[PDB]
Structures are given as C-alpha cells and as structure tokens.
Design a protein around this nucleic acid. Structure first.
Length: 843
DNA sequence: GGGGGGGGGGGGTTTGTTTTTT
DNA sequence: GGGGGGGGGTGGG
C-alpha cells in the first residue's frame, strides 16, 4: 500500500542528507591570525488692519475678478454662508460631497477670507493634509493662482512635502502638507500649538498615517478647546466618521458632473452581439448568497433578454477578466460611437500586455489614427506627457491602465470608460507571517471612483463587466490598510510620540487591528532588541524610531555608519525604502533584464546593482547634460527616482550628523568612507541589517539540467523572482542568501537576494553554538546554519563575537565618530581584517 | 510531474499604489 | 490524496 511510498521517501531523504552533509563551507582563518586573535583576547496689531487693506486693494484687481468669475460657478460657493457659520459654532464638523465640487480648494479659502474680513485675520493658520505629494503640489499651486499670487515667497499660501517646501507667511496663510509632515511635527510640540484650523482631506481612503493622525487629533482635542478640526469625506459611509467623533454635524455639498450611463455585462452582450470563442471566511459567506440566488436570477433574466445573451452570461468565467470581450467592445465603440478617448482598467501587467498584443494583432489597430498608451508604475515616466496632450480629431486615443489612472492621472479628456471589475490587493497573513497578493472584486467605492472619471467636460459612457447580481453583492468598502500591513514602524511611532501604552492606543483606533498582529509585532520588536523587556524603548530603539525608515533598514544605516562605509550603504537603504531606478518598457523586457545583469557585473548580488547604477549615473552627470540622458536611456534607468534617492541620501547623512555618528552632513566625506571600495564589507553590513531573513540554497548536481532549490527556516520552499539578478545563476561561491521582500502571489517569491560569506553570518547573526555531528566541531549560529571548523577556531570565533557584541552595545548607546589611528578597542579592526581577507571558501 | 483525474489548488517562472521637521 | 507512477520525498501519509 502506502509503505512503498514511505520506503522511497526514506531512501531519497537519506541520500539527500548524506549529500548535504558533505557540502558545508569550511571555516578556518590562518596560523598567524590565530596568534593575533589570542593576543588581542588576552589583552581584551497693525497687521490685522494691513490684511484687510490688502484684501480691499486686491478686490479691484482684474485677474482677481476674472478668477471670481469662474469660482462663482462652483457648487460649494452656494453653501458659503453655511459652511463657515457651523465651523464657527461647532468644534468638529464633517463635510461630505460627491465628485465635482471643489471643496478642497474652497473650504479653506472660505475660513481664511471670513477671518480676514472679520478683522481678526492674524489669529488663524490653516493646515490642510493631502494624501499625495503631486496632489498637494497641484492644489497649492492652483489656490495660489486663484488669489492672483504665487505659492510661497511670503504669500498667503504654500505647501510642504518631503525635501520640497515653499512656506507661506506665518500669520494667516494656508499650508498644504502630507500626513507625514504633521506626524513628524507632533514630536517637537505634542499639543500642535500655533495651528488654528486643522483640515484632514480624502480621509475615506483609510490609509495608515491618516488613521493615526485622526486618533491623535481626537484624543488631543481635550487639551485644546480652541482648536478646530474639519474632515472632508466623500459620501457613501460618511456617517461612520460622524458617529466615531461624537455625532458631529454634517454638511452634504451637492456635486456637479455631466450625466453618464452605466452598462452592465448583460447590456453590453446584448448591444454588441458578442459570441464567445470556442474553447477567506467572509468571502465564503457572500459567495454562498451569490450561489443561492444564482438560478432564480437567471429564471428572471430569460424573460428580459434573448436566449443567446443568457447563454453567454451563464457560461461566464468568474476568476479572470476575458480580454476578448474588451477587444470586441473597443471594436464596436470605434466603429459605431462618436469621437472620444477610451480608458480601460485592468488588474495588472499580465492582462495589460495580453490586451495590448491582442489589439495590435488586428489589422485596423495599426494605422496612424489609433494610438495605444499603456499606463503602469514600471513604465518610463508614466509614458511622458503623451496622455495629457490634446488629441487631434480622428485618432481615438486608447489608454490601458491599472489603478494608477483612477487616483492621480487626470487625463480630463476620456468619455468612454471600460471597467473590468477586478483589482489587486496586498493582504497580510499573521499565522504564516507572510504578506500575500491576490485579485479581488472591486468595491462600490472603487466602482464609483472609476465611473466618475468619464463625465467631466462632456457626457460619456461607463461599461462595467459584471452582472447585476455581482453588482448588488459588492463590498461596501475595501479593507482599511490598518488591518493589512505589518505594524512594526507604527509600533515605534506610538512610543516615540509618547501617545500611550503601545497596545492601549491601538484599541482606540477606528477598526482596531487584531490582537494577534499586535502581539506578533511586539514580539518581533523585542527579538530585534529595539524594545525593552517592558516596552521602554531601549537606546537603539530611539535611533530606530527617529529615522524615517523601517527598523531593519535603520539598523543597516547605523551599522554602515559605524564601519565607515556610509555611501553605498546609504544608497542601498534609500533604494530599499522607495522603489528602484529601473523601469521596464512594455515592448522590451528581455533587453532590460539582459542589460541589468551587465550592471550587476560579478557581485552575484541584487542590492549592489543599485550601487553600480548610481555610481555610473553620478560619473555620467559630470560629463554633461546630454550624456546623462544617454546613460539613462541605455540602461533603462529613471532620472527622477535617482534624484529622489540622492535627496534621501542627503537627508540620512544630515540626521546621522545630528545624532553624532559622523562628522559632516556630506554623505561622501573621505574620513567616513575608508571601507567603501570593498564589496565584502558592504555585504557584511547588509547581512548585519537584514539578519533574520536568511535562505539556504542547494544545487542539485546532475539531474539533467542543474537547478538550485531555495529553502527557508519557516516558509517551506521559496523561489527566486524572475526579476532578480540571481534568477538564472547556477554558480554560487557560498550557499547562503539574504533577502528583504518576500511575497506570496502564487508561490513564495524573493524579490531581491544577495549571497553572504560565512563570516558575515557568524558575527552578525544568532547565538553561536558548538557541536560535533560525527564530522568535525561544526559551528552553528542558529542550530540550522551549520559550518565546518575545528574547535580551537570556533572557540576563538565565539569569544570574538561576544566581545564585538559588548563593544557594539557600548558604541551604539553613546555614539562617537571613532578614530582608526589609535589602539583602544581594536575588535572592529580585527573583524574587518578577517572579513576583508581570508574567506574565499568557494564552497 | 504530466496532461492519472477534475484528492487540492502542493507545484506549474513574473509585475496593484503610496507615504516621513527643526 | 491513494496506492496513477515511481515526478519528489523540503508535498503529504
């Protein structure tokens, strides 16, 4: 029976274990190095009236009158008498309005104008929070233009985002900022003084930072009775915020859009006459209802439509969008309907590429007229400003886009919208401690957001791709981001702001996270040694929290600063927290992967390719402006991302100087870059940063094609993502890898992986233990990472590791620049000598 | 692994967007 | 999963 399978399994496992035993890297330093280490171990106001006069003088400006001429047409002006008045009376108000009414650029101006005209115009300072950088810039610029002025330069409006700030004047004025700016402001002055009107906008998205800021405002309102907070949701479940804040008054601002008509799947199939080509938990409960009502619904539909439509709708796939239907719908729209610009929404790249190929396959979609512009976050400069250009008559511009286009693209020309009802979400599995990524049906808010892009300047049409039963059973809203994502950086943010009791505060959030996730995050932080035994923010924790990155990246930055390899480590840290400078165009994907491996050279690493690309870009910038563009074109780089990385490096160096680890704000000073030309030291520092993420690789010698299998301690058998450099590699000097991002899309995937030497794991690793498994005095760092070495060397390695740990604790607790020209604590020098030299195991 | 059979979705190369003082 | 086939056995019994 099943005994033969067990016999096969045992016979294979014995051989596999016997083959893996004789493939462990040997650890041995030298004859003289042992003597040196032994020796070292043995040695161990008129302004108020001025504002009114300026307003009166500007009231006669021709440009100001012209701006008022358009501003009068906005619906929100009709509520100006009310919107201000209640804001004057109540403390917290909720403003709900549909798309079309410019509440963002009107509500703030109403309060400012009322305060200025009333006389007490020097006692207000409105701070409005936006969820996107480009949105904040555009809103601030437009508001500045609306008052016949310019943003910043001491005017009455301005904005502030990361590394870009045009500040307005202190008294009066408006400041548009992202949520992170306010959350960082909360550290200096906890009560947020000198702010008279805090405005939270687009709060219905329910992102991570807005929820925290809203809770802080709610529990801060007790100590600041004179502070006014104004929330702007957008219809639908706008009563939830009012109930949460204590039944505050609400105002419903009417919208204004051109009429649009919605067609569902049955209407589309009936209209275009399309014949098909010949061939958890809660998610279950809804589906059950969709099953129970499935037959009866059809039993009605057969009387409202033809037989063929019912047959096509019944035999319909519910797990993937069919691109043949979209390709036929676009054909029908092109041939019959009038001029416009089709905009189709797709889940991801796998469908965008297929739809583009299907469209370009047909003969008519190849002439001068039709142009197809895919939109994605991994395409060059979102295909430039081609989408924003006005289409000459007789072209029928077609855009195939993921969700990028439903939030901030603003083509402002489309009239036909096609909505394949599928979106991609990134959940987080607490039991398996791995974040997943799946495709789920769009929510009602998502459907409304996609439909609202059609009618803005001209009446249009919206074509949804699901039947009425699925439309009626759609989720009201997407899951709040507070209930997905690890809560690790947030946990340190709670303690650095002294908000409360790390776990007590998280219970006051709207839709509080599950207790298991909080406990897991606290345990992970305790293991990382950032948090004390009783959650007291150990000295490493303060530096980790004050840095604007994840704790793992923060430790890498600190260790790179300690070991005098600041520049490449800072570049890697900057590129590990904000994208990467590589963009893959739609047509050419093999070429990009072939020219990225050339950048990788022979480092057998993924993080080192970013360093090489940045070094090449910096060397090319000095030559000239045209050379920079040529270099970015040849290697498929992005200039904007590289500039942002440069600014982030500057900010990190400034903070490190502020703490005291380094002696200059410049991240390329020659004093703190001694070990900057060695890749081994950089790899050791990276392994010190991202230690717990270590994967073993096994090369199955023979068996037709030589293949490498990657294993992890907990997550079974992972596989290297094809985008990584080491996807096709088969010759590894060391059989160990470290990674940063690991995701479960369909199978567990590592997105960036780099090999590490045994000495990089022995020192910056777990608890070293010495054993004897009938082979030698094998030394293990975590009981599963085993190396071969004699006992006399393993004992020295363990003692040196203990001394290094003590020295690093002392150095991190009290930072110092450290001088390499003296002999006070030379553990670091000996460790650098060991890592730089020796090694070369090639096993 | 392959195309036994449609046990289970354990595997079968890929790729929602977005954020941080002085 | 059983007990197709001996595809792997770090997929499970």
């Amino acid at each position: 029976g099943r005994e033969i399978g067990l016999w096969y399994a045992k016979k294979q496992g014995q051989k596999n274990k016997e083959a893996e035993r004789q493939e462990r890297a040997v650890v041995h330093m030298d004859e003289r190095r042992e003597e040196q280490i032994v020796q070292l171990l043995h040695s161990v106001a008129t302004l108020d009236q001025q504002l009114l006069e300026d307003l009166q003088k500007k009231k006669t400006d021709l440009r100001y009158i012209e701006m008022q001429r358009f501003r009068e047409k906005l619906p929100s002006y009709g509520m100006q008498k009310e919107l201000v008045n209640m804001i004057d009376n109540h403390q917290v108000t909720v403003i709900s309005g549909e798309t079309g009414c410019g509440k963002t650029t009107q509500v703030t101006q109403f309060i400012l104008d009322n305060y200025i005209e009333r006389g007490k115009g020097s006692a207000c300072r409105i701070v409005c929070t936006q969820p996107r950088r480009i949105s904040a810039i555009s809103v601030a610029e437009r508001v500045a233009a609306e008052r016949a002025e310019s943003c910043g330069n001491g005017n009455s409006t301005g904005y502030q985002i990361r590394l870009q700030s045009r500040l307005p004047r202190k008294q009066g004025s408006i400041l548009y900022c992202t949520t992170g700016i306010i959350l960082q402001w909360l550290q200096s002055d906890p009560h947020l003084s000198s702010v008279s009107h805090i405005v939270l906008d687009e709060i219905h998205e329910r992102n991570l930072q807005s929820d925290v800021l809203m809770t802080v405002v709610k529990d801060l309102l007790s100590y600041r009775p004179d502070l006014k907070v104004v929330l702007m949701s957008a219809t639908l479940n706008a009563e939830k915020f009012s109930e949460y804040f204590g039944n505050c008054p609400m105002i419903h601002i009417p919208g204004f859009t051109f009429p649009v008509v919605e067609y569902l799947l049955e209407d589309i199939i009936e209209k275009i006459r399309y014949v098909p080509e010949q061939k958890r938990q809660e998610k279950e409960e809804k589906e059950a209802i969709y099953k129970e009502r499935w037959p009866g619904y059809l039993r009605e539909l057969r009387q409202r439509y033809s037989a063929s439509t019912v047959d096509v709708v019944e035999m319909m796939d519910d797990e993937k969008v069919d691109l043949n239907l979209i390709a036929a719908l676009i054909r029908y729209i092109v041939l019959e309907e009038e001029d416009g610009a089709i905009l189709v929404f797709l889940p991801g790249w796998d469908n965008i590429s297929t739809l583009h190929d299907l469209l370009m396959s047909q003969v008519m979609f190849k002439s001068d007229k039709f142009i197809i512009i895919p939109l994605h976050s991994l395409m060059p400069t979102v295909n430039q400003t081609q989408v924003f250009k006005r289409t000459p008559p007789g072209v029928r511009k077609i855009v195939i886009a993921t969700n990028i286009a439903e939030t901030s693209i603003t083509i402002d020309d489309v009239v036909y919208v096609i909505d394949g009802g599928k979106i991609k979400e990134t959940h987080f599995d607490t039991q398996n401690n791995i974040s997943t990524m799946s495709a789920e049906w769009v929510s009602k808010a998502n459907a409304k957001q996609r439909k609202g892009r059609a009618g803005r300047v001209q009446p249009g049409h919206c074509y949804h791709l699901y039947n009425s039963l699925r439309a009626s059973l759609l989720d009201d809203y997407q899951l709040p981001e507070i209930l997905r994502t690890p809560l690790e950086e947030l946990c340190l943010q709670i303690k650095i702001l002294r908000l409360g009791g790390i776990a007590h505060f998280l219970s006051r959030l709207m839709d509080p996270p599950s207790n298991e996730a909080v406990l897991l995050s606290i345990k992970h932080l305790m293991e990382l040694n950032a948090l004390d035994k009783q959650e007291e923010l150990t000295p490493l924790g303060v530096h980790l929290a004050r840095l604007p990155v994840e704790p793992h990246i923060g430790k890498m930055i600190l260790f790179g600063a300690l070991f005098c390899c600041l520049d490449p480590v800072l570049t890697i840290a900057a590129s590990l927290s904000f994208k990467d400078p590589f963009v893959i165009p739609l047509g050419k994907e093999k070429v990009a992967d072939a020219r990225r491996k050339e950048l990788a050279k022979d480092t057998k690493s993924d993080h080192l390719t970013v360093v090489n690309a940045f070094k090449g870009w910096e060397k090319a910038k000095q030559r000239g402006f045209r050379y920079e563009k040529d270099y970015c074109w040849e290697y498929f780089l992005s200039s904007n991302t590289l500039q942002m990385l440069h600014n982030m490096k500057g900010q990190f160096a400034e903070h490190l100087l502020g703490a005291g680890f380094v002696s200059s704000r410049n991240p390329q000073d020659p004093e703190s870059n001694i070990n900057s030309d060695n890749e081994k030291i950089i790899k050791a520092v990276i392994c010190a940063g991202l230690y717990p993420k270590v994967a073993k690789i096994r090369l199955n010698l023979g068996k037709k094609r030589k293949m490498v299998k990657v294993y992890t301690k907990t997550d079974g058998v992972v596989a290297i993502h094809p985008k990584s450099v080491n996807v096709e590699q088969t010759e590894f000097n060391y059989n160990w890898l470290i990674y940063h991002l690991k995701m479960r899309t369909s199978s567990i995937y590592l997105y960036d992986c780099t090999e590490v030497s045994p000495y990089c794991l022995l020192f910056f690793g777990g608890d070293i233990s010495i054993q004897k498994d009938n082979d030698q005095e094998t030394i293990a760092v975590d009981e599963w990472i085993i190396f071969q070495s004699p006992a006399r060397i393993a004992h020295l390695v363990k003692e040196l590791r203990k001394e290094l740990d003590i020295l690093l604790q002392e150095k991190i607790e009290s930072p110092h620049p450290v001088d390499w020209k003296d002999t006070k604590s030379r553990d670091c020098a000996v460790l650098s000598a060991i890592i730089d030299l020796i090694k070369t195991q090639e096993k």
